[PDB]
TrEMBL record:
Keyword Isomerase part of the UniProt annotation: no
Pfam family, one: His_binding
Species, as recorded: Argas monolakensis (Mono lake bird tick)
An annotated Gene Ontology molecular function: amine binding
Protein name: Monomine
Keyword set, alphabetical order: Signal
Length: 144
């Protein structure tokens, strides 16, 4: 289960975006997501649009520059260390001690059949910490 690089994780397929599927973090807002655009492969920088479910059944949106530092995806002060990513469908990252399993928008109808490398890494790294499911099928589509 050789991981792709942090840049390959950030960029993913280069289209769509990622929903937070499971996390060790409690109190997370439903439909937490990130979506990259304006990918600069040379500089390994992108625009991130991110948010979660707000009012009126609409996703919130805030933008930030996303970049890479070592093996972490950097958004503001958040450095999310890439534990495993396939660069295509899912990522397992560590941020503020929390273990997070993110899924590409193309993978949201198969959450029981995700890349074994992603689920194995998430299950290993969370240890005895209870998981929380943040994604649901009724989450709105990502910002277009
Ligand atoms: N595809 C990477 C998703 C992500 C998680 N955290 C920051 N970005």
């Amino acid at each position: 289960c050789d991981t792709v690089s942090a840049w390959q994780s950030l960029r993913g397929p280069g289209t769509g975006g990622y929903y937070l599927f499971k996390t060790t973090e409690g109190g997370k807002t439903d439909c937490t997501y990130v979506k990259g655009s304006n990918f600069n492969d040379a500089a390994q920088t992108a625009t991130y649009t991110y948010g979660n479910l707000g009012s009126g059944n609409q996703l919130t949106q805030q933008t930030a520059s996303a970049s890479i530092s070592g093996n972490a995806i950097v958004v503001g002060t958040d450095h999310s260390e890439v534990l495993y990513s396939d660069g295509s469908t899912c990522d397992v990252v560590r941020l503020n001690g929390q273990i997070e399993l993110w899924i590409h928008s193309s993978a949201t109808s198969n959450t029981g059949n995700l890349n074994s490398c992603c689920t194995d890494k998430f299950n290993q790294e969370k240890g005895s910490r209870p998981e929380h499911v943040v994604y649901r099928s009724t989450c709105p589509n990502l910002p277009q």
